[PDB]
Amino acid sequence: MVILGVGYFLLGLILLYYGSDWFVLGSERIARHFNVSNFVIGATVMAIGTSLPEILTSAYASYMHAPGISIGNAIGSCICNIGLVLGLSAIISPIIVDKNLQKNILVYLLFVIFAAVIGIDGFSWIDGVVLLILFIIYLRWTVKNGSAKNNPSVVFSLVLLIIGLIGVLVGAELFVDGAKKIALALDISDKVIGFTLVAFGTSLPELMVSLAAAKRNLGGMVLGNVIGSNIADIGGALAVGSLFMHLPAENVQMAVLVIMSLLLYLFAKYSKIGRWQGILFLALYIIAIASLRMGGG
């Protein structure tokens, strides 16, 4: 019970570690095959793939009459993606954002602000429909502005990507499941702590994938994965959750996300996303997890 919890924990870490690199390699190759930028492949394929945990979690939680957990997971992931994921990544591999990608980030900021405004009185299923539709439009807009029998180079690329994705998604589950089995076996299980860590567990793909891309100096891919995941977490995870049940307002967390998203845009536009910007993101994330209400909603 405690040993197989350790077994799942270690195997999950191994799958997350190597799986992320394969997912990054396959995605980088796919981008070159389709003549799209690393940002675009990160903001679409990689972002949605790594956000599959959030979507399922939010859908399931809301369906089970826990809409607090549903939006808690969605928004908490967004704060984690900028604060922790991008924070660590920018320090590892500083990013100077090109003028084209700056417009994408601006559209991201508008989306976030829009979601924050309509969410002041919580999120209804109609709010969900609109956000999902904007999500779809964002994806098509992003691909268009980043664009332009079967080859063994292409095949091997798709194998890498898919197996890499399977690795990080399964790896994240073994890690979470393993940790829960340990805590249960040691009788230190805490539901409030567990639900507080929900967003982090589903964020393990983004974290490991972005660090792997950061190590290979793929800053466009990193930035794409962060921006795209947040949009997927709002226009997808949050949205689907609201389809099952009205989600309660999280005005403080939305306010935190808006500030972080604004900072991200300002750095991208007028500066860079490097060491000291990354330090600030991490510091704000640390302050966030130190002061925000626990229970994950």
Ligand X SMILES: CCCCCCCC/C=C\CCCCCCCC(=O)OC[C@H](O)CO
Ligand Y SMILES: CCCCCCCCCCCCCCC
**Which residues bind to ligand Y, rule: CB under 6 A?**
34, 36, 44-45, 48-49, 55, 91, 110, 113-114, 116-118, 120, 136, 139-140, 143, 236, 240, 251-252, 254-255, 258, 275-277, 279-280, 282-283, 286-287, 290-293
CB of 2 to Cl ion, least distance (A): 30
CA–CA distance, 167 with 180 (Å, rounded to integer): 20
Closest C-alpha to 285, from 266, 262, 251, 257: 257
With tokens 């859908």, the residue in question is: 59
Q: Which is nearer to Na ion, 101 or 127 (CB)?
A: 127
* Of 46, 176, 182, 218, the one binding Cl ion by CB under 5 A: 218
* Cα distances (angstroms) measured from residue 282 to each of 187, 220, 240, 289: 32, 20, 29, 11
CB of 184 to ligand Y, least distance (A): 28
Which listed option, Na ion, Cl ion, ligand X, none, makes contact with residue 218 (CB within 5 to 8 Å by class)?
Cl ion
DSSP structural state of residue 98: P
CB of 38 to Cl ion, least distance (A): 4
Closest C-alpha to 202, from 125, 296, 64, 97: 296
With tokens 């949009």, the residue in question is: 231
Per-residue b or e along 258-296, where b marks 16 or more CB atoms closer than 10 Å to that residue's CB: bebbebbbebbeeeebbeebbebbbebbeebeeebeeeb
Q: Which is nearer to Na ion, 96 or 200 (CB)?
A: 200
Q: Which is nearer to ligand Y, 6 or 143 (CB)?
A: 143
* Cα distances (angstroms) measured from residue 1 to each of 71, 175, 184: 32, 15, 9
Torsion of CA 100, 265, 222, 177, to 10 degrees: -140
Which listed option, Na ion, ligand X, ligand Y, none, makes contact with residue 229 (CB within 5 to 8 Å by class)?
Na ion
Q: Which is nearer to ligand Y, 1 or 159 (CB)?
A: 159
* Of 48, 52, 143, 158, the one binding ligand X by CB under 6 A: 52
CB of 188 to ligand Y, least distance (A): 22
Q: Which is nearer to ligand Y, 15 or 75 (CB)?
A: 75
Q: Decide if residue 44 touches Na ion (CB under 5 A).
A: no
* Of 63, 114, 125, 276, the one binding ligand X by CB under 6 A: 114
Residue partners of 132: CB distance under 8 A and separation at least 6: 235, 236, 239, 240
The residues that touch ligand X, with contacts defined as CB under 6 A, are 52-53, 56-57, 107, 110-111, 114, 126, 130, 133-134, 137-138, 169, 172-173, 176, 201-202, 205
The residues that touch Cl ion, with contacts defined as CB under 5 A, are 38, 66, 68-69, 218, 220-221
